[PDB]
Design a protein around this nucleic acid. Structure first.
Lengths: 108, 203
RNA sequence: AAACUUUCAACAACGGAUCUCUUGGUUCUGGCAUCGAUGAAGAACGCAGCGAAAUGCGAUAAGUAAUGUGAAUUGCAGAAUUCCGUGAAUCAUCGAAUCUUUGAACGCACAUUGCGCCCGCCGGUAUUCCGGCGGGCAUGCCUGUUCGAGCGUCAU
RNA sequence: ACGAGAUUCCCACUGUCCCUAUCUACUAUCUAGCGAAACCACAGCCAAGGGAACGGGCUUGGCAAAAUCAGCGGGGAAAGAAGACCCUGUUGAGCUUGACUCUAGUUUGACAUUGUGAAAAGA
RNA sequence: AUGGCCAGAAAGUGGUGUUGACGCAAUGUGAUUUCUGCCCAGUGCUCUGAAUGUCAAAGUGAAGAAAUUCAACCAAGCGCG
RNA sequence: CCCACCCAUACCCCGCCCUCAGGGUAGAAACGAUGCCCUGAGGAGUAGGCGGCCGUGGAGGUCAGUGACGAAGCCUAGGGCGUGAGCCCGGGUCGAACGGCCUCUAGUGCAGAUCUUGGUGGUAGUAGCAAAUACUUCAAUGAGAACUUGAAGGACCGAAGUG
RNA sequence: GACUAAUCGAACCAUCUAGUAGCUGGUUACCGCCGAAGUUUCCCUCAGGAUAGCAGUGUCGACCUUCAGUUUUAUGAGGUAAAGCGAAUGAACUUUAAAUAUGUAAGAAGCCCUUGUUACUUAACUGAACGUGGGCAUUCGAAUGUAUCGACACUAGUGGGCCAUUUUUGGUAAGCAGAACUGGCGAUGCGGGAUGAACCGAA
RNA sequence: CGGGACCGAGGACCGCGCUCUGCAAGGAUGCUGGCGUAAUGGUCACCAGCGACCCGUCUUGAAACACGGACCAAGGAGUCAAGGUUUUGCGCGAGUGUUUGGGUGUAAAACCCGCACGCGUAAUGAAAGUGAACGUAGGUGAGAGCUUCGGCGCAUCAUCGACCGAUCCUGAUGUAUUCGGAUGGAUUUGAGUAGGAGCGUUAAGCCUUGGACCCGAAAGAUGGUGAACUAUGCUUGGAUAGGGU
RNA sequence: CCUAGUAACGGCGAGUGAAGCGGCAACAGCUCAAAUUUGAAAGCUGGCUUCGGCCCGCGUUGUAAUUUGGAGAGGAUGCUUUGGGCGAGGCUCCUUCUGAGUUCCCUGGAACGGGACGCCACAGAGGGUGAGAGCCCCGUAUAGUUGGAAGCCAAGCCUGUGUAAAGCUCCUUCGACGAGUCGAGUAGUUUGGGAAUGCUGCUCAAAAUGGGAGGUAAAUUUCUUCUAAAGCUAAAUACCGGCCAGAGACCGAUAGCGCACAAGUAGAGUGAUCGAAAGAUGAAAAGCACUUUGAAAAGAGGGUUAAAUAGCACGUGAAAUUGUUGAAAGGGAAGCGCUUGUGACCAGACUUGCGCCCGGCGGAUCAUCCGGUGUUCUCACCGGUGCACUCCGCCGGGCUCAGGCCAG
């Protein structure tokens, strides 16, 4: 607004390579850490797994359906076997999934 | 970074006509629906998968059904655009799955289709009889025949008895190995030809 | 003391600010597609009982016909209207018409109301003279018709 | 020879001067009528002091009496003087030259337009 | 004169030109009289006189699997004389 | 060398204004708590920075707002309030609208720009109305006659003319 | 360099165009609270730059720690005056010791001791540094003052100006020209110097 | 113990006290007179004593010079847009943003809808690529607040460690015997991790680009109009006493 | 919209800058050349028609049918498909018509203002009418309702049926597909494509699983995508021109377009061009009869009007500046600040209130109790009861206090 301006108060006193034809769809690969991995489970079923009411069932999580392509290994996981389907995975993330008791499945 | 070094004020576009253009589009759609009644306002579209590795996780509506899809659904290519089916001769079926899905889509549409005779007093065998011509109908094929599952389900439950064993050696090691052979595919072939030539020379 | 100069006040002057008004601009939005050789846009000259302009119109000239409304127009003058009606009006609508000289402008020209040509009709004693009236006479190109030219190719 | 070209001198001649005076007409003047403009912060007597070499206004003095008319050219005003001159420019423009980059014109070569035959020399 | 001097964006374009050396075009000096200090050869003027010394494009040859690279040849002008 | 005396916006005491700082204020008889009560210190200002308020055109809400028994505007040696920008009233004129409060909004505040447009002074009843030889008498007309007319005179152009 | 419609070292008309200027002029109510500055350091200069320093609004952190254009104490520079040489020796003599301002230091955030290592150093486990542990709160170890804290963020002007006292360096026939500190002015009214940028008193 | 001047802030009581029936003790009362209106007070004009340069701009350090101002009314100059940045207010929060579009409507309003997308949630490297826990998300010294009074210790700061990417060195088990890169070190590096903080919006300051606070050049360019003046030329016309030699 | 100020381009850097995907709006597909109809040019312009057709011709150097790459041509095979004519009804466009006070009172020149009593409302948008009007008038809202024209959509209903055309399925075979064009070199220009862009000129100049493209030059071997050098086509998109219409937190006659007016006019310039100023009496002209003075313009009486303090100089009527009247000052400037005085002119303040003691009046809304009601649940109001030593006003006195200004 004009009436709040200072002008109204002052009234009276005045490297590397080049990539030709770059396509970002080649390099699209969003990543998610394992400390966000259980957030992809719906909240009710997630709470049932965390409480321990499913001792005969293991969850399968597809990252590509959630919009992620790579699983990274920041954080820690609970002792629940989880099947993870991903295009890419880091070595620490796969190690921590194996320690938690699940398996990392590679998809395209 | 402001790009105002040309005569930018000569071609400034404002959008005060946004509500009026919405009103005009709605009036045109109402007129089109009234002219097309009782047919739907749009054509049946196939389900296709988006290109590139970024968008190949999601499906959407395409332009039209292929000739192979129409032939496998038993709809002639001259009859198809006259009964609300869009036809695309450019698209091909490189796999069974999309072909079968679109054929089932066409069969569902043909099962739900009501076809009035060209002459009311001379019905034909391919036309819908008058006692079946009355039903509750739809006027939006994009709504009644939308993409129900654009993405795969992100969550599934299995028992721990059927957890897969996994790739031997690890998924990370499998990816590194696949990249290694992809980079070294030519070197192994060249050394194999060299060894074969040496063996042929000194057999 | 007056006059004079200046100041203050009232009233009167000068001038057109202020206030209020707005058949006007400005901006946005919605709808529509319609100029011209069947002569446009523009220009000039004329037309009302009494107008110079603006507006309207074209020698049928502030206009004609047709449809509708239904009693005016107005500054003056002069006439209304059988009012129980083919009917006032500077009325509206508008399908029929008129539409001067020009202008892409078209017989040749135009700084000329200059000079022609072709075919009819009429009038004056008129086979010959004179006058008037009407219809025509640009260029490029297309299709077709008809009349032609050339040892260019042939038949005979 | 010719010259509204620049210069020195001689005779004649005379108000150029000694040295000014006088006359005429039209103005200026006064009246009737008609009637501007330039310019104008405010105004207008001086002397001494007012550091920045400047006072009209300040300080200290001289002084100082309405309203006016004809003249005058000291001062203030007054010069299309916001001129001229000097200085500065990321200055503009005209002009010159083996300044830079270009270019009209001119000149030379090649390709095409460009065909039919000979005679020699090569490959 | 298949020329010179010009003009035009170009033209089956125009001028000089209805012209032809007693002519046309461009310079310098500027009536008449007087009048050409002495001698050259550095800049310049012009000589198709021999050279390939510089030497563009096109063309020719060699190597390479090719892109390409390397060689001679090389007009006018410059250079030399 | 000595005594008294004069006075600055300096110093002392008192009042008031503002700013800053430190306290108090609910089993609320309790307050524009954005208030009120107590105490102390300080007060110049260019460039510059910040805060609060006044005013103008228009918008929403509100004041069951004002008004032909007179809105707005204007004049006023007539008053009241505010440190101030301003606000309010009385009197006269006048004729159709306008205002207060809280938010919203801007083409919002002038002495200058050799500013723009319009209007008006002093100068000033002043400069001036002085080239082309020149006018005069009677009568008529008319409200009014140097510059209208008729007659009577006097002159000028002077035939490359004032024809 | 004349003329080409009062226009000519390149006419007039419209448009691009509200062309550009670092140069000139102007830039609109009030009150309140603060409030400045002129080589500090670096860069090739003038037709140069940044930058230190000085300011205002906000905040935040325990606005915790205290610090200070001051004096004193110890110790430097200035041993320079001075007293004596019945002290020695002879400004350069000294037992002693100036005025003027000036550097450094004056605590628990400190002081040492011990332990070892050293890649420092030393003849050297020797000093010192690095750590380790312990002892020291009996007075926290001069005066005076202390609404004076610190860190961010954002914003602004000025950043090789004038005058003067003192110190110091050079000079001129005489004038004077450089630096360093301080004060005043540019921004400032008041009383007195008759008057007034630089004087006195006082804001 | 006298003589005089100026002032009277506050508004029940509370307190310190004293000379204690009361008081000069945390701020003036008592008595009396005239008048009750222009008498006091105020405004305007004028005289008188004292005081007092004409404003704005420019310049430098400042004056002076210089520039603008005859007078009055109305008009008249830091605006808008886009993009950043810091701060304030608001909503939601590891999410956030309905308004390109669709639905709806009392119709440019309001209300409703969701896919994609932007920003943020992960960085580093030229790239290929790889990608953040030894530990109650670590130790030490501070640190508001709390405490069962032993300590626990937010934000933040200092310091020592740990992890991820990049650079250099070594090269393990294995093996498409030529691939793979574990393990261990050494440097700087990155607003990297180490118990997310952002997204949208409002308001203010500042910065960048646009005519960019307003007025002002000599200029440059594009397309047109003039030889009625004047200059030269062509065609066709016209004109110029009397003397001397 | 996003991609994205990204890939990329750029002296001495100022700067420049797309595209694929993705979401949405809107969707619609096709026609030739290259084939022999060859058992029949089956095609077409024009002229004359008796409206049956007949002629002059075009054309075989190719007009019809068929085919267009998604294919098709030829076979096989067995089923499907078709042409006309009515048409209820609906929509678009001009037309007839629509509710309610001029009721009473006051002010006013005039109610459309104020007060009262009503009414209409799917209409309280707007305008006019002598001042702010839902009901005075035009219109406004909604369903409809008259009359007319031309189109489009359309539920259904009558009839011919297969001479011919058309679709589907399968296949040995065949399967023509655009040349100075593509491409290459060079030059200019352009682009983010100054290593990967497009266009044009000159030179060279193709091919048959060939050719183009696959954003770093080349060779070899592959792969993936289309099928150039012929052509048509609605929609979503643009719009300072034209016509019609509706609006606005816009401007209110120096503003807003140059123009609200006989404005692109008057006027200027040879010309190209340049280009203004200028709105408002009053509700109604009722625009001043008549007399008088002047040659006249006009003036004075007298009129109109609600008002001439509205007189075609016309609503309101500021300032600069001017005249008259009144007051004042003035010995070479005025103007301004502080403080008295003089003269002129003014705003306030005050006028008496409160509380007692008597006397005289005029009334029982005194205290208590009862019932009802409401509340804050113990406080009140209402109805009865007071019978005048109690309450409430009034009128005369007397008393105390507080009251204005200047002073001792």
């Amino acid at each position: 607004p004009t009436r709040f301006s200072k002008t109204r108060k002052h009234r009276g006193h005045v490297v590397g390579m080049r990539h030709f034809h770059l396509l970002r769809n080649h390099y699209w690969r969003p990543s998610i850490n394992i400390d966000k991995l259980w957030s992809l489970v719906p909240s009710d079923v997630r709470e049932q797994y965390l409480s321990g009411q499913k001792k005969d069932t293991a969850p399968v999580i597809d990252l590509l359906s959630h919009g992620y392509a790579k699983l990274l290994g920041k954080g820690r996981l609970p002792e629940i076997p989880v099947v993870v389907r991903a295009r890419y995975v880091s070595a620490e993330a796969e190690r921590k999934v194996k320690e938690a008791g699940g398996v990392v499945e590679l998809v395209a | 970074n402001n790009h105002f070094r040309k005569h930018w004020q000569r071609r400034v576009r404002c959008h005060f006509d946004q509500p009026g253009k919405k009103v005009t589009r709605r009036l045109a759609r109402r007129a089109k629906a009234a002219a097309l009644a009782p047919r739907p306002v749009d054509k049946l579209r196939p389900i296709v998968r988006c290109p590139t590795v970024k968008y190949n996780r999601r499906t959407r509506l395409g332009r039209g059904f292929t000739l192979e899809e129409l032939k496998a659904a038993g709809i002639p290519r001259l009859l198809a655009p006259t009964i609300g089916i869009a036809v695309d001769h450019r698209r091909k079926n490189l796999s069974e799955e999309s072909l079968a899905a679109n054929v089932q889509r066409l069969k569902d549409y043909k099962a739900r289709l009501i076809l009035f005779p060209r002459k009311s007093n001379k019905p034909k065998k391919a036309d819908t009889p008058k006692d079946q011509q009355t039903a509750e109908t739809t006027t939006s094929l994009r709504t009644s025949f939308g993409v129900e599952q654009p993405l795969a389900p992100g969550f599934t439950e299995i028992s721990k008895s059927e957890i897969p064993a996994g790739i031997e050696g690890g998924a990370y090691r499998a990816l590194r190995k696949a990249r290694s052979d992809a980079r070294l595919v030519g070197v192994r072939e060249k050394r194999a030809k060299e060894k074969a030539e040496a063996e042929a020379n000194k057999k």
